[PDB]
Design a binder for this molecule. Structure first.
Ligand SMILES: Cc1cc2nc3c(=O)[nH]c(=O)nc-3n(C[C@H](O)[C@H](O)[C@H](O)COP(=O)(O)OP(=O)(O)OC[C@H]3O[C@@H](n4cnc5c(N)ncnc54)[C@H](O)[C@@H]3O)c2cc1C
Ligand SMILES: [Mg+2]
Length: 479
């Protein structure tokens, strides 16, 4: 097998079900498994908070450990991807560059640029899809060329397509004997960087640890303990294959003689992911409002202070602030916690663009996912997909049903930990003497509520009603 190959990890930070890396190994005599840490590209294309960096560095360290166990290595190269490639195609006499075929426009532009560079430097470019359950083009083809815009129509198309794609085989030590992974000269240049190298606090205090190893452990541990799986960061980073997880769930359904539906329900979660991936792959301007053909055009308020309070857990609604605090401190929050804060920010209370919430979630979520994040933010703002706009989450009462003593609030907002339960969700209703007894003066130690919920939601309902009465055709696209 003739090629000398660089495999570029972008997502797909895993050795199981990695079709591109497998294709690289099967076509090559020499391989350099590379992660390019390109601060300029990342600065131009995304927003990445400290917890996300920690999770990435952990996933890269794990990939390096796992590659090393097979007699290979991970090479982390810090630089601009085009200049890195020009240098190392020369250094290593590269004839093929492989990379996962991601659907995100910034990854597609990178891929386009690498293919142009290949035509110039003399390397072929090979990419395989490892991020989706289905061949997205086949879904579009069955739907007439456009993406299904409802989950119902999506499931109808999938029922014509059949089963998802199956995972490819695991990589073996024998793969790296047939296709050698040479130790480059100056191999210290290619170490996974430590947090200090990224100007980031050295201690990761998120209960999540990145990497394929932990993703697989969690995956197997969830199937043993059985609250959701908590696997989203691993799917978003590609430490875990959705095709592998889907098939694992099919295996359980098979061993239960088709009598266990909880694995089927969980497969449905992956199908929601596929739904948004499919819409996102074929919709112009998917991650913004303007120019987005499925998105209601809503004159959201430009109020950076309102956004600032929401982002920094200073809304004065403890349920909202506790959730935003968990997001900031841990990088993951439950699906319905995301509903609560996203509705509050957008159609419910603050009337701030879903684009701004999306960007905050992008910075803070370990599982930040281009397609999922935008699709769900359009959903939670009733900009597309969701149409029950008279239903607004109550930032006080929703948590009361869930957690009447406010243990979650007391955990994430310790300033409120001594508030009697009758005030824990609305501490501004306590008398000043009760505030003094709790050791927490509202407006000083914890803010007053930034809006009157009833007034704000009343006003926003009227605005949303006008939008939907005027933009009927756009609303109907996703109904
Ligand atoms: C405003 C908002 C923003 C969101 N942003 C993201 C994001 O950036 N990344 C992300 O992975 N999820 C996002 N979600 C979806 C959802 O909240 C998370 O996928 C889920 O909380 C992850 O927890 P889990 O892995 O335990 O999920 P499980 O219930 O165990 O689901 C298994 C997997 O299915 C997928 N999935 C589950 N729910 C959804 C959904 N509603 N839409 C699409 N895929 C889904 C995820 O890959 C998840 O890991 C967002 C939801 C909202 C409302
Ligand atoms: Mg679930």
């Amino acid at each position: 097998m003739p090629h000398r190959t660089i495999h570029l990890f972008r997502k797909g930070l895993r050795l199981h079900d990695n079709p591109t890396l497998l294709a690289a190994l099967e076509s090559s005599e020499t391989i350099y498994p590379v992660y390019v840490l390109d601060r300029r590209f990342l600065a131009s294309a995304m927003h990445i908070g400290a917890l996300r960096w920690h999770f990435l560095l952990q996933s890269l360290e794990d990939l390096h450990k796992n590659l090393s166990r097979l007699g290979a290595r991970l090479l982390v190269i810090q630089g601009e991807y085009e200049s890195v490639l020009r240098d190392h195609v020369q250094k290593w006499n590269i004839t093929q560059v492989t990379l996962d075929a991601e659907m995100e426009p910034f990854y597609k532009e990178m891929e386009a640029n690498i293919r142009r560079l290949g035509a110039e430097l003399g390397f072929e470019v090979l990419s395989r899809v490892g991020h989706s359950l289905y061949d997205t083009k086949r879904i579009l083809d069955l739907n007439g060329g456009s993406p299904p815009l409802t989950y119902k129509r999506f499931l109808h198309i999938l029922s014509q397509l059949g089963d998802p794609e199956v995972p490819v085989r695991n990589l073996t030590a024998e793969d790296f004997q047939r296709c050698m992974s040479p130790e480059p000269g100056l191999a210290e240049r290619y170490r996974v960087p430590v947090p200090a190298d990224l100007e980031i606090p050295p201690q990761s205090l998120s209960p999540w640890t990145g990497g394929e190893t932990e993703g697989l452990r969690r995956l197997e541990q969830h199937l043993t303990d059985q609250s959701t799986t908590g696997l989203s960061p691993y799917f978003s980073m590609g430490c875990l294959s959705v095709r592998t997880f889907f098939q694992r769930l099919s295996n359980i359904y098979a061993q239960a003689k088709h009598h266990s539906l909880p694995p089927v329900s969980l497969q449905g979660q992956l199908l929601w992911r596929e739904f948004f991936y499919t819409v996102a792959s074929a919709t112009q301007n998917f991650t913004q409002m303007a120019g987005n053909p499925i998105c209601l055009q809503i004159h959201w308020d430009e109020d950076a202070e309102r956004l600032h309070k929401w982002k920094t857990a200073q809304t004065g609604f403890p349920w909202i602030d506790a959730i935003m605090t968990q997001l900031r401190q841990e990088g993951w929050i439950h699906h319905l916690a995301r509903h609560a804060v996203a509705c509050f920010l957008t159609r419910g209370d603050l009337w701030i663009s879903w684009e701004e919430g999306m960007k905050v979630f992008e910075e803070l979520l370990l599982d930040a996912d281009y397609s999922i994040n935008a699709g769900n933010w359009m959903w939670l703002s009733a900009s597309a997909f969701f149409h029950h706009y008279t239903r607004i989450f109550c930032p006080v009462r929703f948590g009361k049903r869930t957690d009447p003593e406010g243990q979650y609030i007391r955990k994430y907002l310790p300033v409120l930990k001594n508030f009697p339960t009758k005030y824990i969700y609305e501490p501004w209703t306590a008398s000043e003497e009760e505030q003094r007894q709790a050791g927490c003066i509202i407006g000083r130690d914890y803010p007053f509520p930034m809006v009157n919920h009833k007034e704000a939601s009343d006003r926003n309902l009227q605005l949303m009603r006008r939008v939907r009465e005027e933009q009927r055709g756009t609303a109907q696209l996703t109904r």
